[PDB]
Design a binder for this molecule. Sequence first.
Ligand SMILES: O[C@@H]1[C@@H](O)[C@H](O)OC[C@H]1O
Ligand SMILES: O[C@@H]1[C@@H](O)[C@H](O)OC[C@H]1O
Lengths: 753, 761
Amino acid sequence: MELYRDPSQPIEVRVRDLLSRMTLEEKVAQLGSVWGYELIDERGKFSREKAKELLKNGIGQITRPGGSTNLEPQEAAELVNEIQRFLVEETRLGIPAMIHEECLTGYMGLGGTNFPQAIAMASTWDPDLIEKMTTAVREDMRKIGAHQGLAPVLDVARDPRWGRTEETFGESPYLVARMGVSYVKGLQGEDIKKGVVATVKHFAGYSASEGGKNWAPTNIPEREFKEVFLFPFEAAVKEANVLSVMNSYSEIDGVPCAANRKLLTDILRKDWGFEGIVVSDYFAVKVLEDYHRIARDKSEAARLALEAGIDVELPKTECYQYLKDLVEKGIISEALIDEAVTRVLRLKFMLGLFENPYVEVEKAKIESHRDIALEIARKSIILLKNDGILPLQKNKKVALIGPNAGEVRNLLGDYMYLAHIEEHMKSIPSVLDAFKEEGIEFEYAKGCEVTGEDRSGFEEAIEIAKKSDVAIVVVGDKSGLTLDCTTGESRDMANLKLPGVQEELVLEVAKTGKPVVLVLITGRPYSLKNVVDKVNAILQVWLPGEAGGRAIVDIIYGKVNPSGKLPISFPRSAGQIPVFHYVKPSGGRSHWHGDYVDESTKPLFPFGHGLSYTKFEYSNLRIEPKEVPPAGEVVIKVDVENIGDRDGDEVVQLYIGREFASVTRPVKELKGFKRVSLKAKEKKTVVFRLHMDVLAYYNRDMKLVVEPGEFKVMVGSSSEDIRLTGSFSVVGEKREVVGMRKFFTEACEEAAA
Amino acid sequence: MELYRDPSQPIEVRVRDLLSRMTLEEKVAQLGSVWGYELIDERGKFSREKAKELLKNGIGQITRPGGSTNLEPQEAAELVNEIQRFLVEETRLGIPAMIHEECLTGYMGLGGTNFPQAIAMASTWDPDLIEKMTTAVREDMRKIGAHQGLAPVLDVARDPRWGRTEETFGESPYLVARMGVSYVKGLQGEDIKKGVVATVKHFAGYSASEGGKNWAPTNIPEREFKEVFLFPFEAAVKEANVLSVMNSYSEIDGVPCAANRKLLTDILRKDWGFEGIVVSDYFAVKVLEDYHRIARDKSEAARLALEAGIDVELPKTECYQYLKDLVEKGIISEALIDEAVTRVLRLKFMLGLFENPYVEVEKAKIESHRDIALEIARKSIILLKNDGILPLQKNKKVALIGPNAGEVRNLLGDYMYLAHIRYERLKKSIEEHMKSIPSVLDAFKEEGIEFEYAKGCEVTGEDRSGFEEAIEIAKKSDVAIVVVGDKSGLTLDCTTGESRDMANLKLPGVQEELVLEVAKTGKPVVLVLITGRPYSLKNVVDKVNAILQVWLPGEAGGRAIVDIIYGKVNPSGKLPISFPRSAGQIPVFHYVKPSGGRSHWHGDYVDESTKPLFPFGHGLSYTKFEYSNLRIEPKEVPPAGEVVIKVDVENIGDRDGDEVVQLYIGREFASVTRPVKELKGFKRVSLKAKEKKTVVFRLHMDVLAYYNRDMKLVVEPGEFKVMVGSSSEDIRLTGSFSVVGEKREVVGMRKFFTEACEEAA
Ligand SMILES: O[C@@H]1[C@@H](O)[C@H](O)OC[C@H]1O
Ligand SMILES: O[C@@H]1[C@@H](O)[C@H](O)OC[C@H]1O
């Protein structure tokens, strides 16, 4: 029995033993990948014939054995068992494969629940609920033999033109970091042998491209890069022990992230102590040549990516095969191959793959998590505006108008299987279905398509509105990767107008003088400047997946009290970009008239905005001690009372302001929050335990510091709807924050007195 | 006498002698300033009473003795002579004042020519002509006793939302640097005792504020900062020997430029060898407290600005008076005061102020340079579009429509005196002096055109009252000339200028609707934009027959527009900045990386092209130019070698005209990503009909240097692409040459510019 096969030996001993036994060819194969679809026949069964060519020397990863085959869970599990049996039994060393799938909004394959999009997850401000979700996704993935999910997007979004806004947790480094750590914790176990490797992406800056254009340069200076952009990845590595990172397609200031050793090694591995694998974004190595034009051939692209710190080329071996030739010709040292292979082998051993690489096909049927999807959908929907029309009485005749009332497909995000892809059909409930099921009397008129300028349908929509009590206009996006989609990866929107003639559809329906409820089923903020004052209520419904219809109707009729809060600012117009809550004293205004000539510098809806069908009263602000030394702790308490007549969740938000630091600081920035459930007339105390570590920022010399001085405390229902204000002082000498530090405020509830 | 008063002693000896004689109070006064208006009575005469308080211990600078007093040139000269006599005769040490004025578009005071705005200057692509202009401004300034002009703005503009776009030379670091060096050379001349100190501003990044908003953070990473924003300042310091720099109001990534020693000292003085004075932007020191909130009081703001490298607080001593208290209390070293005073005194001696601080009031009448202003206006106007309607025949009946056809005030930029300065006596005096400037209406009458004028709308507001009159005059005419765009200045009623940022880039008020209404008559339409920024023309471009871009042209504007419309002048201006299709497209610039200027993998936005409506270098002619016979010699050059690029250009059309020949350089397979194409050379060439000439670009490899992964300035072996054309998109001839040898680190002084000339074909 070779040491690497012996389960009593420590993993480092098994890794060293296996590495010492491997040829150069076997080493380079562990840094590569193959598509699931390249290993099946036309009957969807494992093809030994194809495996003999592609798997002869073993392999790092199988890419999307479920997601790329259109196989049902048990068929996918059978394919993976067969791939593994070939590797374990018909290769010299019998190294098993790691399998990855997409899983952002749930396992991206047939039979997997479509959870609401990441921007919806963020809008819950409920990290525990996102952890519950990814704990369910973990079980789904392990059933089909999948070890790695291309997991939370930790890109901080302040440019809603960008088609991937829907995949982010929004504009706030704090909220993004807090959701990212809960997401990673749910996916990964305490013990990864019983869990799924999370992949934080896209490291780093990919959400701040020139003009919001996909893959365009992300030109971010160092303090902003560290405090925004890197912060959530830092928290995922150090607090959540994330085991994979995927690079950004974009250059930072001349350097493609896939060729940046200062980023993928010096920051990620050396500064932060990351011990997992870096996987390329798909084709990110090859396009160092094709797109960025800094690699003269595939072998130079391979050298740049390996030197940078990419361990696995995805989604298929292309450049990394030439690492063999680079060593044989003495261009690179085999020792650098060994370093990457060591990280891959370590993770394979930790995942339990050498003890048992197989799953029980009989237990591989994936269960529905519609219950969890529905709780996210119900908590994620945001009431942007309500003049009193909502909630509606069930006896009102409804004119249900718009492309996103009827569609079902337009409820789905860019990484939901049925959008991303006769096969496990769209038996997903529509909004129209949810209205029927709720017993509402309505007529449906489509009014218009998502795209185009055809106004044919306007007259039917107008006529249905005139014969109704209330018009419910359901407009917004089709999310995906193709030209006909208005949002999603590769679908960037310069001017932030609702797609096609949807805005004109709303204004035409409004001209009937009937009450209008505007339901935005969208992947990004749109400019509502021209419709906001012409409609009575506005619901923001971030691409909600399969639970969307029921949640929208539940909220419209007050069976659910809306509790979602914006995780990203809604610009008045594209020309206002960017707008975010944590501007410096000189940000978020034009000096000395405050506004643009043509436009407010304030967003239409601010960060943390979301209304309720009840009222919350904040009282009794306590900040103790009042003076703390630079590594001390302050305890901030507020009482919150539901003074209205409906049960509701309030999201209590802590903003911290700093002036007279050695650098300029945000006038206010989110540093804590708590979703608190309050029955009508119930009062509770929300408590924020704020360690000074959490308030650390980079000084003029790029040191992480806490400086003596006064911090402003602002607690409220949004970044603008601040209810209580106070301060505390840090007293003592400037502190350099070195090594491990706290990233998060600790937020809980107490009985009020 | 004392060594400092002895003109046979070297300046360094005179400086050391004077410094050793000065009290702490006299030293700190040399780092301060006083407004001209603080030293006059109500009649605009020098007030000894006021001077005894403000000038008792001497002073660094007098701020705008002409620009802030509303005095005529000879009255301003008399005030400055009196200020100087007080300082020379009634202070202990008799140190004279340095005087500064604004002078971007000419001396900013009564009696000064209003030259076209800087964005117009850039549109000429004629650096020699801008040098001729600032040589004239130099004589104007020296007549009234003014020693320093706050002029060449070297901010690189790629965000047309920004109200100060009009003050820049546009988007191209190369074109900005090339115009900046000519601007500075004209103002300074070879010996500064006979010249005027140029002040490059605003150091550094002030044109790239968050959302195009005035003073908002300018968050620029290091390679882009060095190659785009710093480059023109670097060329101005090292090639043009500029003697003053003014800081930016903005923070870079948490650090206000006024408090940034790494910027104002480590880059400017240590890395580049700048020997002149850094002057604050107005109140830039005080607002370290009031705006940025990083100084707890005026004394801490003073310490941050002095440590950073600001020598003179403008426009009035406010924080810098507390430097005295900071030394007396042992918070800062007097040695740091001494270093700043040394720079101020050195410049005063070099200006000749200790030998003769006075001017002849009798010779202080400033001459008109309308001739130079007219050459700039005629060379700056850009023909964006022409289906053949231009030039017009003089016998066509013209409907002259729009707020900028009739309003002479809207010809003026934000630093032209009559626009900038706005008791009841000041209002009357502006309205009085305003009547002197020819209007566009005046130019049409003078040319003998048959026209009716309708002011279809105001610049701002939503009043469509005037539309009907405008439409009716259009229907009775052969051609509608619609003249629309900006009112430039600093107040709420202005649409462009400092503090007037435009988020959505729509023509102001209902001007766009006025254009579309006139177009609906089915009459031919010539659209004339009199503007300080690119506007979105997306909704009008395809509805009009011709478009002229007329960057705020000053007093020569009317005549130049009429000359061009009737073909007395062949238009030859080229865009120095990209015209976005929409605000949501921002930024668009010609020198994007392979991954810039597109969304991957469909190329375009869902709703919009990623390409500008009009690209960098765009400008049509009433003739056609044919490019042939591209030569690049040698084909292989070592990393400090030279390539000679030659093209023949023939005027194949029917009219004499100027072509601006543009050299773009591309680089792939560097160790960093490089622009697909970037302007590295240009030449304005005059061609008679059927005349052919050879344009020659002498390109030293120094000019192509870029920053590598380790932040070294390098030339790397490989291929450089040569693209010569009539715009950044209208490329006529391409080829390439190779750099062969070992990677070169470009150390110390290097060439910044291609050498461009003409020879016989
Ligand atoms: O997010 C990644 C995306 O950028 C790429 O196209 O495909 C792989 C994904 O994991
Ligand atoms: O351009 C400068 C401007 O920024 C400031 O407002 O006043 C002084 C000028 O020189």
